[PDB]
Design a protein around this ligand. Sequence first.
Ligand SMILES: CC/C(=C(\c1ccc(O)cc1)c1ccc(OCCN(C)C)cc1)c1ccccc1
Ligand SMILES: CC/C(=C(\c1ccc(O)cc1)c1ccc(OCCN(C)C)cc1)c1ccccc1
Lengths: 233, 234
Amino acid sequence: SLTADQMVSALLDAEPPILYSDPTRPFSEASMMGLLTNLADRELVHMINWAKRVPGFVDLTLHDQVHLLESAWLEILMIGLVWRSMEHPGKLLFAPNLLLDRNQGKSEMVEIFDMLLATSSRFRMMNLQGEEFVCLKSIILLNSGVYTFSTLKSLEEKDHIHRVLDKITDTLIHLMAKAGLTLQQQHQRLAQLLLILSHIRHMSNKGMEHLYSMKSKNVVPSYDLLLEMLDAH
Amino acid sequence: ALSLTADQMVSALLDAEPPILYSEYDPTRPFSMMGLLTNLADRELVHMINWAKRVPGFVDLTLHDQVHLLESAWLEILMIGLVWRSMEHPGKLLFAPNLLLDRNQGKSVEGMVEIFDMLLATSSRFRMMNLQGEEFVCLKSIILLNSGVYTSSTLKSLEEKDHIHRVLDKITDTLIHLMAKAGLTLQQQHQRLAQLLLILSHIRHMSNKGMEHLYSMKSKNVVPSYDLLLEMLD
Ligand SMILES: CC/C(=C(\c1ccc(O)cc1)c1ccc(OCCN(C)C)cc1)c1ccccc1
Ligand SMILES: CC/C(=C(\c1ccc(O)cc1)c1ccc(OCCN(C)C)cc1)c1ccccc1
């Protein structure tokens, strides 16, 4: 129902803050997973607030909202990381007080590290804009779990998600058209942006693989935990 | 290769299409699932290599970069093919014309039922979208070129990446042309382009789940090595 410009402003308004990591005591590479886990768990609370502010998301059932977040949360964390690392070549800006390069990633993730750095590089080359970024993040939330939900309710939920996804596509095209791009450039850029999302899913899968391999009780946010965070009064 | 028309690009991809293979099993014999699928895939991979070489722009790359792209994309390519020929068979996966299974038949293998349902959902989405053959071959070409392009600073590799992105742009223009030829409005054009490309994210996910299982098997030959792929390409 909203216009493209109304859509962008809504997404920009809903943006989560950049959080910080740790005492200015000596640094050690052993505590790296500790720092990143603490940060992530903290961001995830804010991500829930952001999601409820993505247009169309709260129109879904509580169950489907959880399913979408369950599928997308690490992808969302990762595109956020890649975004704030964009203007810091060769480094990943996990937090403003936690900026690491390749060699420091070797602490058992250097594979994922290199993949994130390459995505940052790609964003840099494409001159990715903030307005485009918030659209892509919204798309990840809506798309990542939409294929893994019969009932009439489900069919209506799926149709709604696809209609919102169509709206974000229109918004992306409008941003490019505002920027002065030709129709050919618009289509080509849209495609370039969406193809990156495949790589972000890949990195998320690799990351989730490690998280499950840790064999710890809450390393992956449970359905029940996500439900409680979403199901607010 | 970067000078073809949209129609020339399409006819090139359609002519390059690999054949549908059959499962190897005695049909007179009683009703091994992983054994059947592994044999099918291995035979399919040989034809996939011939196909890759006829994708415009691919052979312009170094043999090293060709192997890397195929390394990243081969199971994705097998899966989108599986989804495509399963499209007109709701609730079933058509692994081969003599091997059509439903939901409960994937339970024979650990974790397969998860993948099974994800594949069925993709075929359903394809059917809903009324995906066209010409669109399909474009999507499969995109998978080949895009999946490995993010995994360099050497002048040559900068040239290689540049080339891959120019080819991907050409396929994008081709997709748009197909849709414009079918009378879609500009809005419906870019909306459909987005819908199709977003499905490729789910296909990556399914490949990753599948790769996790193949690796979980402690077999030396199950995952095709760089050398094996280089032998086949070169
Ligand atoms: C790439 C960094 C990422 C972490 C991360 C990414 C982005 C960001 O903004 C913050 C952190 C990461 C690490 C741990 C983690 O699991 C903790 C989750 N809770 C839910 C138990 C999540 C992300 C990571 C994921 C898997 C393995 C190693 C590292
Ligand atoms: C989803 C079916 C797929 C098989 C398949 C995919 C596409 C196709 O057209 C036909 C069958 C499959 C299974 C194993 C496999 O690896 C074999 C090892 N070779 C590659 C050395 C490839 C495909 C599969 C992948 C992982 C585990 C179980 C099944």
